[PDB]
Design a protein around this nucleic acid. Structure first.
Lengths: 149, 262, 151, 185, 129
RNA sequence: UUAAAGUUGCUGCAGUUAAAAAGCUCGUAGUUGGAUCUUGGGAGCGGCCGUCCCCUGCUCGGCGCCGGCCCGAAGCGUUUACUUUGAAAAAAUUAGAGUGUUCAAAGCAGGCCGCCUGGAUACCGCAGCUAGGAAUAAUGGAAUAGGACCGCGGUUCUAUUUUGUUG
């Protein structure tokens, strides 16, 4: 089940057993490398790069062709984002929720959802501190929310 | 307790003193001497329980200060004198001498010896000291300070001293391949050969001793008395030669002796 | 950097005022350093050899010996000077409920300035000494870094 | 010559003969456009079960990706130059011991025994890639592995499955049976 | 979420044995599960059991027969000694003529009589009879 | 006061209605955490298997020989819990061996005609010390290459066996 919801949904991907590049693919590893470089220079999430590649380029999985995933390529080239994308989206959602609440005082369930997403932000920040990705002195607070990217 | 103890209860005595319960409240606390309290044997205990020469505590005193018993060549008039390992005791008038060796079990045993073997005594060196004007010194396990020793006597060797002059005659070096026996612990009186000697820095250095029939055991460094150079022992061993018969072979031997005796 | 307090700090084994032939240069002004091997398979570090700190409770350059028990722990706090507190986490067993419990008994050990590359979480080992203070009995023999800290 | 070796020892007469045959094959054909830098490490002839034999070529791993587009014609030229012996390209890989508490960096998972055995099994069947795999455990405690392949490229592979089973039995020691199910395509 | 895969596998095969079916779909895979099922096969309780290879997690299909009474798990893993094991087979086995206790050993996953004759012991796993 | 009490429930209790799920949710300390890493082989006995041996590297030497081989060793080898062995762990007491206190509770005595003995053994929770294995559970190796390896290239402090006796 979800960590903040009573739902028990089962909807996700299903990777095939066959571990081989397709023969009909005409995109070499180099060509998808500057494809990923151009899509990252356009300012996109790596998941957006993956969905764009899988739709408009016919590649099944990048790590089955190149040999590594998108964030490894972006870190090896030197254009990966400083903050991870899911925690950045959670921060932006928290800023949107707070800009709703300090404009609209009387709503309560939105404050409940704000508490839930703040707990999610805290747990993901604790995991990133444990994995030594975030700095150990990093701390999220509301008073520097909109000033933060 | 504001001072040293002077009494000793009967059930607080060591087990190798080999007493009973329903005789008296107290036990003979030995006078201070060369040997420790739990590792020695009083003269009253030997003369009243082992040799059966006396029955009460006054008869032992009469025999003791009658000037009849000589301890390592010196006459002693203390009934609670500590007698320990290889303490040569002699009776001059009836011509008997005893050597105190631990037997196959955890106790002392009576062992009559010839007078020619009663003239010397094997004893273990404890530590090496340097005196005032550059005199090397030896401290022996029965607290015999000997001046000017042989230069090849090390920390854990065994020297042989004539009881009439106090000097060193011959020695045994601490090495593998020498006949050894243990003084204290779970193993006591077993005669064996040193094979291994494991060195642990900052703690007890255990050794490994193999018996003459195929048994092996491990004891500490302080629980070592070297008695021979090879296979031949330098002293007369007691009965059984210290083989530590197990309970099955002991039962079989006792049953065979009972069947043969009838 | 040195000679902070109201008395001179020196090592009372060496003589620091030997009279040379010249009392000028080229052979002087390099004072000898007193050090010893503490034993138990431990190796003295270079910081105790070429350092300039002065101690009386250091296991290498000092008047304290190492004997007894060898323990280990994790460094928790570095607040009081020249000595630190470590944490020993151990498991205790109950005969009735056949299940363990973890316990901690923190206690203060002595850190010489020889080991100054110490942060919170570093694993250290200690050796038993004579009482150096009211609650300090142990001296640190070596330091081991924790995970990460690759800088 | 054509053959090189990571070990500093002279190659034997059989692998030198295979190297000379490969050099002749690229000499009198158009293979020289794709074999200027590509070479051979080792060769071995082993008794495949029955009256027919086969040869095994040890190839370095980074050269097998170059060979992966080339095996369409080399194999058929190798049975046509020989009498009837099949040729199998098995990549060489190093099997490292497990780092125990007795016996330096991390041994990667790619060099582990299971990984190199699965990679040998994958490189064993080049035109028919892996679509299914089952393991049978009989009453004797032994493991009978089974390999299921696709319904594409059957007629050129189905006469060499016993050769693959024999060389996998000799190289590893595991009984592997090959089957062609008709499931997806 | 899931803690022990052996507990779920043993509960699933016990339920499918009580309902009287012949094939059981064990969805996790583990070395201890394969070794436990191998011990049960070697002591004549099951038949041909499968290992379905997959790049996610293997699945085990067993050939049941009308031979198993109950197989279970002792959670958490209790360590035993050689003298301590006698109380465990006193209060866990239904009889002394049959039944087995599988316990973890440095020699491998292996039952209690063999661990007795090899003079060893370790953490417990489960039981079957 | 103990057993009966499975009426304190770790083994081993109950929580819809008999006593008892906080109104609901987040959350720190605590407790519990998925798969995955060396498989398989050989010399042979009883006739494929229940017992036998084999799959960590380096500075000095005794079991043997003709500067060349094996054996051993001053000294080092990723750390834990778990598991088996070893040391030590006072006696009495608890089991327990011997012994016709007339039996027994006892006690460590006693039996042949000066002789022969016994006065054992096990247990001693845990914690500290040691030696074979790493299956089980948790940590760490390198991703900013301040990663291994190989032979080269620059900067310093110190050792008597020597530039004809001696400075």
């Amino acid at each position: 089940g979800r960590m903040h919801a009573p739902g028990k949904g089962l909807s996700q991907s299903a990777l095939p057993y066959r571990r081989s590049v397709p023969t009909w693919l005409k995109l070499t590893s180099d060509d998808v490398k500057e494809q990923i470089y151009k899509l990252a220079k356009k300012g996109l999430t790596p998941s957006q790069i993956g969905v764009i590649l899988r739709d408009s380029h016919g590649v099944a999985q990048v790590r089955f062709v190149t040999g590594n995933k998108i964030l490894r390529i972006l870190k090896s080239k030197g254009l990966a984002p400083d903050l991870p994308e899911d925690l950045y989206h959670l921060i932006k959602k928290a800023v949107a929720v707070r800009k709703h609440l300090e404009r609209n005082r009387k709503d309560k369930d939105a404050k409940f959802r704000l508490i839930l997403i703040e707990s999610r932000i805290h747990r993901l920040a604790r995991y990133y501190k444990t994995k030594r990705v975030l700095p150990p002195n990093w701390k999220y607070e509301s008073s520097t929310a909109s000033a933060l990217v | 307790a504001r001072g040293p103890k002077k009494h000793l209860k009967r059930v607080a005595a060591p087990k190798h003193w080999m007493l009973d319960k329903l005789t008296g409240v107290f036990a003979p606390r030995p006078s201070t001497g060369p040997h420790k309290l739990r590792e020695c044997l009083p003269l009253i205990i030997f003369l009243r329980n082992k040799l059966k020469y006396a029955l009460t505590g006054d008869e032992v005193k009469k025999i003791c200060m009658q000037r009849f018993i000589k301890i390592d060549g010196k006459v002693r008039a203390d009934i609670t004198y500590p007698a320990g390992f290889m303490d040569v005791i002699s009776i001059d008038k009836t011509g008997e001498n005893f050597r105190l060796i631990y037997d196959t079990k955890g106790r002392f045993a009576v062992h009559r010896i010839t007078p020619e073997e009663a003239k010397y005594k094997l004893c273990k060196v404890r530590k090496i000291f340097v005196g005032t004007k550059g005199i090397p010194h030896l401290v022996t396990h029965d607290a015999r300070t000997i001046r000017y020793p042989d230069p090849l006597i090390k920390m854990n060797d065994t020297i042989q001293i004539d009881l009439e002059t106090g000097k060193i005659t011959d020695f045994i070096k601490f090495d593998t391949g020498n006949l050894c026996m243990v003084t204290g612990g779970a193993n006591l009186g077993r005669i064996g050969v040193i094979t291994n000697r494991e060195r642990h820095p900052g703690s007890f250095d255990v050794v490994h001793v193999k018996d003459a029939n195929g048994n092996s055991f491990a004891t500490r460094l302080s629980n070592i008395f070297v008695i021979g150079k090879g296979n031949k022992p330098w002293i007369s061993l007691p009965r059984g030669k210290g083989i530590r018969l197990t309970i099955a072979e002991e039962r079989d031997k006792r049953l065979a002796a009972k069947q043969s005796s009838g | 950097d040195i000679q902070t307090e109201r008395a001179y700090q020196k090592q009372p084994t060496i003589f620091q005022n030997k009279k040379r032939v010249l009392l000028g240069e080229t052979g002087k002004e390099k004072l000898p350093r007193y050090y010893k091997n503490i034993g138990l398979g431990f190796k003295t570090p270079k910081e105790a050899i070429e350092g300039t700190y002065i101690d009386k409770k250091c296991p290498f350059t000092g008047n304290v010996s190492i004997r007894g028990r060898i323990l280990s722990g994790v460094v928790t706090k570095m607040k009081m000077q020249r000595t630190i507190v470590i944490r020993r986490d151990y498991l205790h067993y109950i005969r009735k409920y056949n299940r363990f419990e973890k316990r901690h008994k923190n206690m203060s050990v002595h850190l010489s300035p020889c080991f100054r590359d110490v942060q919170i979480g570093d694993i250290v080992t200690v050796g038993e000494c004579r009482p150096l203070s009211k609650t300090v009995r142990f001296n640190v023999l070596k330091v081991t870094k924790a995970a990460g800290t690759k800088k | 010559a054509k053959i090189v070796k990571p070990n500093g020892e002279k190659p034997d007469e059989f692998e030198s003969g295979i190297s000379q045959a490969l050099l002749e094959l690229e000499m009198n054909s158009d293979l020289k456009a794709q074999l200027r830098e590509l070479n051979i490490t080792a060769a071995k002839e082993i008794e495949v079960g029955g009256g027919r034999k086969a040869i095994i070529i040890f190839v370095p791993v980074p050269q097998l990706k170059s060979f992966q587009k080339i095996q369409v014609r080399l194999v058929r030229e190798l049975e046509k130059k020989f009498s009837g012996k099949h040729v199998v390209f098995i990549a060489q890989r190093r099997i490292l011991p497990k780092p125990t508490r007795k016996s330096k960096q991390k041994r990667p998972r790619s060099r582990t025994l299971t990984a190199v055995h699965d990679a040998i099994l994958e490189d064993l069947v080049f035109p028919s890639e892996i679509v299914g795999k089952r393991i049978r455990v009989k009453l004797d405690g032994s493991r009978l592995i089974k390999v299921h392949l696709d319904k594409a490229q059957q007629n050129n592979v189905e006469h060499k499955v016993e050769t693959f089973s024999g060389v996998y039995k000799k190289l590893t020691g595991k009984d592997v049976n090959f089957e062609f199910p008709e499931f997806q395509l | 979420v899931r803690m022990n895969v052996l507990a779920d596998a043993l509960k699933s095969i016990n339920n499918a044995e009580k309902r009287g079916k012949r094939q059981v779909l064990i969805r996790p895979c583990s070395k201890v599960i394969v070794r436990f099922l191998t011990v049960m096969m070697k002591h004549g309780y099951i038949g041909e059991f499968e290992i379905i290879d997959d790049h996610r997690a293997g699945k085990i299909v067993v050939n049941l027969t009308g031979r198993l009474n109950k197989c279970g798990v002792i959670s958490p893993r209790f360590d035993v000694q050689l003298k301590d094991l006698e109380k465990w087979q006193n209060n866990l086995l239904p009889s002394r003529q049959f039944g087995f206790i599988v316990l973890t050993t440095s020699a491998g996953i292996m039952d209690h009589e063999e661990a007795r004759r090899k003079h060893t012991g370790g953490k417990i796993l489960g039981f079957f009879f």
